[PDB]
Amino acid sequence: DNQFYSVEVGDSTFTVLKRYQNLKPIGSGAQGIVCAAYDAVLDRNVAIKKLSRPFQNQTHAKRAYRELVLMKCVNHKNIISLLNVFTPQKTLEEFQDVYLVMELMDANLCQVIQMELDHERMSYLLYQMLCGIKHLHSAGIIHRDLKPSNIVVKSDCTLKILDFGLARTAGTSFMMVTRYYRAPEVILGMGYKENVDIWSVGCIMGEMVRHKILFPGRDYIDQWNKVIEQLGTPCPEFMKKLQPTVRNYVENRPKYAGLTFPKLFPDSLFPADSEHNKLKASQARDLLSKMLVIDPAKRISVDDALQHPYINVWYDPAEVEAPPPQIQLDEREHTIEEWKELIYKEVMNS
Numbered sequence: 441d442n443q444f445y446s447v448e449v450g451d452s453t454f455t456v457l458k459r460y461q462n463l464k465p466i467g468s469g470a471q472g473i474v475c476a477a478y479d480a481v482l483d484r485n486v487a488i489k490k491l492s493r494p495f496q497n498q499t500h501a502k503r504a505y506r507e508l509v510l511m512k513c514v515n516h517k518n519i520i521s522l523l524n525v526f527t528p529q530k531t532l533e534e535f536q537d538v539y540l541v542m543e544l545m546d547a548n549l550c551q552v553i554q555m556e557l558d559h560e561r562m563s564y565l566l567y568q569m570l571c572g573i574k575h576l577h578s579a580g581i582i583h584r585d586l587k588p589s590n591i592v593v594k595s596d597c598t599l600k601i602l603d604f605g606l607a608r609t610a611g612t613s614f615m616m617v618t619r620y621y622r623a624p625e626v627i628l629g630m631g632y633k634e635n636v637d638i639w640s641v642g643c644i645m646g647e648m649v650r651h652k653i654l655f656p657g658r659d660y661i662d663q664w665n666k667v668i669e670q671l672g673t674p675c676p677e678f679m680k681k682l683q684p685t686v687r688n689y690v691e692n693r694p695k696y697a698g699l700t701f702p703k704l705f706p707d708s709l710f711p712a713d714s715e716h717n718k719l720k721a722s723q724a725r726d727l728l729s730k731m732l733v734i735d736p737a738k739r740i741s742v743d744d745a746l747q748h749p750y751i752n753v754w755y756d757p758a759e760v761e762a763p764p765p766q767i768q769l770d771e772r773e774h775t776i777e778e779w780k781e782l783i784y785k786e787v788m789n790s
């Protein structure tokens with residue numbers, strides 16, 4: 441501990457470089473302790489994340505290696521970037537902790553989502569989401585678990601995605617707590633395509649309008665009921681694309697016509713008494729009717745969503761058509777000891 445010092449932050453021991461001062465707690469759970477700090481060397485505020493038990497198991501180590509490699513290789517304004525990475529331990533043998541240093545954002549989408557919406561801020565947040573998701577897809581990264589807690593925003597309304605989800609897997613399976621934003625093809629295990637992340641964007645948008653989670657529930661069974669009660673029972677063609685065992689339960693459910701999108705998202709939930717606000721309520725509802733579609737064969741793509749009148753007002757080829765990032769590796773299994781060495785070399789060679 442020459443260039444390092446210790447400090448207790450939010451019931452967690454932070455052994456960080458002497459350049460990071462005035463550490464303040466900001467977040468924790470379901471895996472990872474985060475705090476805010478001032479970088480003396482850069483004269484800027486940062487966010488420092490201490491990884492929670494990265495070598496407890498192979499899933500933690502695979503997810504830690506994946507996140508560290510992707511945060512380094514990706515360089516997009518709508519995806520959180522890695523400013524610095526360090527370990528207070530001097531050797532591979534002693535190595536046990538990883539500290540990721542990133543730009544400090546003002547709030548999480550979980551609180552911004554609760555704000556009284558204006559079409560300007562709302563369309564801008566969704567535009568940035570679609571931009572970041574487009575950039576991940578270009579590199580073959582299908583998130584599959586996009587949620588408000590995985591997204592951070594700044595005072596100027598600029599947005600960044602924190603996570604990469606299941607990333608480069610193949611796929612549609614997570615074993616760990618918030619499943620309200622997962623696409624039906626993921627829930628029912630049908631296989632996914634790139635527009636699987638569009639359902640999650642639809643869920644988040646619907647929530648910005650309603651100020652209530654669209655599809656809540658104790659479990660998937662309860663969650664699927666909330667989907668069919670509101671959007672209606674899917675077409676026989678979709679239920680045909682299900683394998684016989686889950687198909688049996690889905691087809692045995694009571695048939696629902698589903699509430700129309702005017703009834704799901706009435707004008708009451710939208711800014712009123714202006715011609716511009718009237719126009720914008722129907723455009724927002726129309727985009728929801730294209731994103732919140734059970735059948736992924738009929739759901740809108742990221743590219744077409746960016747082309748929608750509600751979003752296209754922000755379209756900038758410099759932000760949207762940016763070059764995809766290129767590249768042990770990201771679908772091969774290793775022992776926990778082997779992930780530790782892969783993780784140690786990433787922290788050291790940066």
Ligand SMILES: *[C@H](CC(=O)Nc1ccc(C(=O)Nc2cccc(Nc3nccc(-c4cccnc4)n3)c2)cc1)CN(C)C
Pocket residue numbers: 466467468472474487489542543544545546547548550551587588589590592602618
């Ligand atoms: C909503 C999730 C929920 O329960 N509510 C919630 C609120 C806040 C946070 C949180 O800690 N995020 C947060 C809060 C305050 C400032 C910042 N700024 C920031 N800047 C850069 C990086 C980070 C960061 C990185 C890694 C992990 N966490 C934060 N933060 C951020 C969490 C949860 C549930 N929905 C999923 C419905």
